[PDB]
Protein backbone atom coordinates (compact mmCIF):
# COMPACT_ATOMS: atom_id res chain seq x y z
CA UNK A 1 0.00 0.00 0.00
CA UNK A 2 1.16 3.35 -0.78
CA UNK A 3 2.35 5.61 1.67
CA UNK A 4 4.80 8.93 2.34
CA UNK A 5 7.40 8.74 4.68
CA UNK A 6 9.08 11.63 6.09
CA UNK A 7 12.21 10.72 7.32
CA UNK A 8 13.68 13.74 9.69
CA UNK A 9 17.02 13.29 10.48
CA UNK A 10 20.62 15.35 10.33
CA UNK A 11 23.03 16.02 7.60
CA UNK A 12 25.31 13.06 6.81
CA UNK A 13 23.19 10.37 7.96
CA UNK A 14 21.72 9.75 4.81
CA UNK A 15 18.58 7.56 5.43
CA UNK A 16 20.12 3.55 6.14
CA UNK A 17 18.62 1.40 3.90
CA UNK A 18 19.44 -0.90 1.25
CA UNK A 19 17.05 -1.02 -2.50
CA UNK A 20 17.14 -3.28 -4.91
CA UNK A 21 15.53 -3.84 -8.40
CA UNK A 22 11.97 -4.45 -7.95
CA UNK A 23 12.05 -8.37 -9.66
CA UNK A 24 8.89 -8.79 -7.93
CA UNK A 25 5.54 -8.63 -10.32
CA UNK A 26 6.63 -5.24 -11.16
CA UNK A 27 3.16 -3.88 -9.85
CA UNK A 28 5.04 -0.48 -10.16
CA UNK A 29 8.96 -0.52 -11.67
CA UNK A 30 11.05 1.29 -8.68
CA UNK A 31 13.34 -0.14 -5.90
CA UNK A 32 12.52 -2.55 -2.51
CA UNK A 33 14.32 -2.12 0.28
CA UNK A 34 16.05 -5.50 0.40
CA UNK A 35 18.51 -3.99 3.66
CA UNK A 36 18.29 -1.06 6.48
CA UNK A 37 21.14 -0.10 9.10
CA UNK A 38 18.50 -1.04 11.56
CA UNK A 39 19.60 1.81 13.57
CA UNK A 40 19.59 5.29 11.48
CA UNK A 41 16.74 7.74 10.75
CA UNK A 42 15.30 4.60 8.41
CA UNK A 43 14.77 2.80 11.66
CA UNK A 44 14.31 5.38 13.80
CA UNK A 45 11.45 6.38 12.07
CA UNK A 46 9.93 3.35 11.63
CA UNK A 47 7.90 4.51 8.23
CA UNK A 48 11.07 2.57 6.38
CA UNK A 49 10.76 -0.94 6.53
CA UNK A 50 12.19 -4.01 4.61
CA UNK A 51 10.20 -5.48 2.23
CA UNK A 52 8.79 -2.15 0.85
CA UNK A 53 9.39 -0.35 -2.55
CA UNK A 54 10.22 3.54 -2.62
CA UNK A 55 8.19 4.91 -5.87
CA UNK A 56 9.29 8.81 -5.55
CA UNK A 57 12.20 10.39 -3.17
CA UNK A 58 11.76 14.34 -2.72
CA UNK A 59 10.24 14.56 -5.86
CA UNK A 60 12.81 12.20 -8.03
CA UNK A 61 10.44 9.64 -9.35
CA UNK A 62 12.45 6.39 -9.27
CA UNK A 63 9.75 4.62 -11.01
CA UNK A 64 11.20 3.86 -14.08
CA UNK A 65 14.99 4.06 -13.44
CA UNK A 66 17.20 1.01 -12.79
CA UNK A 67 18.95 0.52 -9.33
CA UNK A 68 21.84 1.98 -9.95
CA UNK A 69 20.12 5.21 -10.71
CA UNK A 70 17.63 5.34 -7.74
CA UNK A 71 20.45 4.38 -5.47
CA UNK A 72 22.33 7.29 -6.66
CA UNK A 73 19.03 9.63 -6.27
CA UNK A 74 18.86 8.54 -2.70
CA UNK A 75 22.66 8.75 -2.20
CA UNK A 76 22.32 12.32 -3.57
CA UNK A 77 20.28 14.09 -0.72
CA UNK A 78 22.85 12.40 2.07
CA UNK A 79 23.20 16.01 3.39
CA UNK A 80 19.61 16.89 4.58
CA UNK A 81 17.41 17.46 7.09
CA UNK A 82 14.20 15.48 5.89
CA UNK A 83 13.91 12.66 3.60
CA UNK A 84 10.30 12.66 1.79
CA UNK A 85 10.14 9.10 0.17
CA UNK A 86 6.61 7.95 -1.18
CA UNK A 87 7.07 4.14 -0.98
CA UNK A 88 4.56 1.00 -1.22
CA UNK A 89 4.20 -0.50 2.24
CA UNK A 90 4.53 -4.28 1.52
CA UNK A 91 5.42 -6.02 5.05
CA UNK A 92 4.45 -9.44 5.89
CA UNK A 93 2.53 -9.55 9.39
CA UNK A 94 2.30 -12.79 11.37
CA UNK A 95 0.03 -13.26 14.22
CA UNK A 96 1.27 -14.95 16.57
CA UNK A 97 -0.74 -16.56 19.09
CA UNK A 98 1.01 -18.18 22.07
CA UNK A 99 -1.34 -20.05 24.44
CA UNK A 100 0.69 -19.98 28.20
CA UNK A 101 -0.92 -22.15 30.63
CA UNK A 102 0.98 -21.13 33.49
CA UNK A 103 3.58 -18.86 34.29
CA UNK A 104 6.34 -21.31 34.57
CA UNK A 105 5.81 -22.69 30.85
CA UNK A 106 8.25 -21.78 28.02
CA UNK A 107 6.99 -20.19 24.79
CA UNK A 108 9.56 -21.97 22.46
CA UNK A 109 11.62 -18.96 21.09
CA UNK A 110 13.58 -16.30 21.92
CA UNK A 111 13.15 -12.25 21.01
CA UNK A 112 16.28 -10.23 20.67
CA UNK A 113 14.68 -6.41 20.48
CA UNK A 114 13.19 -6.68 17.51
CA UNK A 115 13.63 -9.67 15.39
CA UNK A 116 13.61 -13.63 16.74
CA UNK A 117 16.19 -16.33 16.33
CA UNK A 118 15.29 -19.40 18.17
CA UNK A 119 12.58 -21.39 17.85
CA UNK A 120 11.08 -24.93 19.24
CA UNK A 121 10.96 -26.89 16.55
CA UNK A 122 6.37 -27.78 17.33
CA UNK A 123 6.30 -25.36 20.18
CA UNK A 124 3.64 -22.64 21.39
CA UNK A 125 5.52 -19.86 19.83
CA UNK A 126 6.12 -21.40 16.25
CA UNK A 127 2.18 -22.95 16.49
CA UNK A 128 1.19 -19.05 17.05
CA UNK A 129 2.83 -17.34 14.18
CA UNK A 130 6.52 -16.22 15.28
CA UNK A 131 9.46 -17.38 12.98
CA UNK A 132 13.19 -17.40 12.75
CA UNK A 133 13.74 -14.13 10.90
CA UNK A 134 10.96 -12.38 11.28
CA UNK A 135 10.68 -8.53 13.26
CA UNK A 136 8.25 -8.81 16.15
CA UNK A 137 6.37 -5.56 16.70
CA UNK A 138 2.55 -4.93 18.18
CA UNK A 139 2.73 -7.49 21.07
CA UNK A 140 -0.99 -7.55 22.56
CA UNK A 141 -1.22 -3.65 21.28
CA UNK A 142 2.56 -2.63 22.80
CA UNK A 143 5.22 -2.26 20.01
CA UNK A 144 8.06 -3.79 20.92
CA UNK A 145 9.79 -3.26 17.34
CA UNK A 146 12.03 -0.87 19.45
CA UNK A 147 11.88 -2.46 22.80
CA UNK A 148 14.85 -4.61 24.28
CA UNK A 149 14.80 -8.05 24.14
CA UNK A 150 14.52 -8.23 28.13
CA UNK A 151 11.53 -6.44 28.33
CA UNK A 152 9.73 -8.67 25.41
CA UNK A 153 10.69 -12.04 27.13
CA UNK A 154 9.59 -10.36 30.29
CA UNK A 155 5.52 -9.84 28.77
CA UNK A 156 5.62 -13.41 26.93
CA UNK A 157 7.40 -14.93 30.62
CA UNK A 158 4.34 -13.43 32.51
CA UNK A 159 1.61 -13.10 29.59
CA UNK A 160 -0.03 -16.23 31.15
CA UNK A 161 -3.33 -17.12 28.50
CA UNK A 162 -3.15 -16.29 24.89
CA UNK A 163 -0.50 -13.63 23.73
CA UNK A 164 -1.55 -12.29 20.44
CA UNK A 165 1.47 -10.03 18.57
CA UNK A 166 1.78 -8.94 15.30
CA UNK A 167 5.45 -9.61 13.81
CA UNK A 168 7.03 -7.97 10.29
CA UNK A 169 10.04 -9.26 7.90
CA UNK A 170 13.59 -8.12 9.31
CA UNK A 171 16.70 -7.79 7.44
CA UNK A 172 17.07 -10.12 4.22
CA UNK A 173 19.06 -13.34 5.53
CA UNK A 174 21.92 -13.98 2.76
CA UNK A 175 22.49 -17.78 3.83
CA UNK A 176 26.28 -17.66 4.32
CA UNK A 177 27.75 -15.81 1.24
CA UNK A 178 27.86 -12.31 1.16
CA UNK A 179 29.90 -10.90 3.96
CA UNK A 180 30.24 -6.98 2.88
CA UNK A 181 27.10 -5.27 3.10
CA UNK A 182 25.49 -3.59 0.44
CA UNK A 183 25.09 -0.11 -0.64
CA UNK A 184 23.20 1.89 1.96
CA UNK A 185 21.56 4.75 0.71
Given at each position: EFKDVFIEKQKGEILGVVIVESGWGSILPTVIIANMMHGGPAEKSGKLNIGDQIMSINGTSLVGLPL???????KGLKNQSRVKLNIVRCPPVTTVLIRRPDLRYQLGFSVQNGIICSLMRGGIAERGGVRVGHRIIEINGQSVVATPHEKIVHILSNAVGEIHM???????????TAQEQPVYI
Open positions: STCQSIIKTMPAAMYRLL
